[PDB]
Amino acid sequence: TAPEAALGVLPRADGSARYSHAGYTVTASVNGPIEAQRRDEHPYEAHVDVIVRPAAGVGGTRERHLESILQSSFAQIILVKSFPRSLIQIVLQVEESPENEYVNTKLVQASLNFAVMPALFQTAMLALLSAGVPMRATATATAIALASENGATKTLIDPSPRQVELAQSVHVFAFTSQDELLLAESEGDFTIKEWDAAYETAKNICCRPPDLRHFIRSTMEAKVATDLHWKS
Amino acid sequence: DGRRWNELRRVHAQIRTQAAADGSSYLEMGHTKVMCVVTGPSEPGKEAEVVVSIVIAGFNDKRIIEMQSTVANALSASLHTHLFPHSQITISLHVLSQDGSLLAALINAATLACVDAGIPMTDYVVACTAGSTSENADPLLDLNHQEEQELPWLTVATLGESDKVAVLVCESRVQVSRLEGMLAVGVDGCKQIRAILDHVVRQKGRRMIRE
């Protein structure tokens, strides 16, 4: 219902974070600018590596897509230029996902999981800020899914996995603090008119005068002030 | 069967078996048979690295690499790895037949292969496989393949006559009480297998110095 997260969960890591919302629990590790294996290394600018670790089973091809998307989006947020040859490592392990009571477990799935994406983008951003990596801006992402059975259209937000299969179409969005779309993905049978309504509904998380912008700030604020208790 | 617990399978060991190798060994414990050929301390085209390769003749990949890792680490403590930094040592072991206690034969045969190569050894490293045989007690020194399925089998490797154990591996369950009697048995076997091994090294040398 309301997002809940914590920072510094993994002590040894340069930065770590845990996020829980919509029945999705992610714990993420961020490693500061690091020497980069030459095959991975790009000289002029840094290469950000994202590893998505499934809660159960082994990394699927879909899991390879979910990481590629996250890297491209996060690189604009991150300031790749500052550290020339450094490797920024983001590792995410999902501890829990909402169960689908209506189908038995299938370990390997090829489809692109739009439902886990919204939790990861929010999870990583929290961890990266703990790392201190230089960033142009901060971005938040949620996902919207549309169902037609009710007639007209019913908007379902932060969807569950059973919901996306029953739903006619799914759409995931992500916004920078400067309100602009960094990533957008949708699958199903839908119309641009319905999409624009999902974009403006998604826009609400991004601009406020749930409240994602406040959540990240508040979560950071408590740790920041907690860290700065020494100023006294 | 037909073997007293104290008694061990017949052993025939050959040293410098390979006509042209830095070091070689051939060990047969009963029916099990092992051949070892060791490249001398040499540099590939800090402490020295030992590679162990075991090839099972056609008559589980995880079991092999586990055995390879075991022989290497055991030999590595006995071997004076520290003396030559840049050199690499390679142990190639091939098994013609199996009667159980395979690991023990490999570590025994390999240790015989090392002393031939002349690589400095802190001491012979020798191992046997012993079992409890269920409160009646007839602990056994040499385990047949038949006997290992029936009874729990423990493989123990020692630094020669000393009670010290470099390797102890048991993949079959035993109650803690039975263990204390099982290891000492194995330890007693090791000195026997060292004795035959030391005889094999000494007899060849007597002929070599004679020749």
């Binding site: 000289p43 002029y44 040859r85 | -």
Partner: protein, 178 residues
């Protein structure tokens, strides 16, 4: 337009040259190309393909981009060979002693060159390694194009130094006499 193996000429009439494999006193072409002849010394024949992908040869001018600058050397991809752009890219390294023969000890990599610049240099020698070796010692050889640390395109002011136009800042680098 001879195919590989056309019997170009008897060894007596002409001398072996690039693109020609000579066997049994009958020189033959080794590549599909348009033949040429140079005409004391007999004439030389050659066959040339219509990108040549030529291997760097010592003493040849090369244009190249600096991947990194390091205290003892410079690491530079050899992007182009004179008149032949290289579809195949071979790395090349420039030594501190090689950048400027004058004032050798005073010459430092950081002041001479900077990443992202494009340099013009000869091949001092073959690699003796995976990385070929080059030198910018000759006065003519120097950074031909540069991008400022700010990112602004830099226009040369003096041989030792480059000026960033908007910044007004000046960065020291060897620049080409021509």
């Amino acid at each position: 337009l001879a195919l590989p193996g056309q019997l170009l000429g008897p060894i007596s009439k002409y001398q072996p040259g690039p693109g020609t494999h000579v066997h049994e006193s009958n020189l033959y072409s080794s590549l599909l190309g348009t033949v040429h002849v140079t005409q004391a010394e007999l004439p030389t024949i050659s066959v040339s393909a219509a990108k040549r992908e030529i291997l760097p040869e010592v003493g040849n001018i090369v244009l190249c981009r600096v991947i990194r600058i390091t205290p003892r050397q410079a690491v530079v991809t050899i992007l182009v060979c004179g008149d032949t752009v290289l579809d195949a890219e071979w790395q090349g390294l420039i030594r501190v002693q090689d950048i400027r023969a004058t004032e050798k000890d005073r010459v430092k990599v950081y002041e001479s060159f900077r990443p992202g610049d494009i340099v013009r240099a000869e091949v001092i020698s073959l690699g003796d390694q995976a990385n070929y070796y080059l030198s910018t010692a000759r006065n003519e050889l120097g950074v031909i194009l540069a991008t400022s640390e700010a990112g602004n395109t830099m226009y040369p002011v003096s041989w030792r130094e480059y000026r960033d136009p908007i910044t007004g800042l000046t960065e020291l680098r060897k620049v080409a006499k021509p």
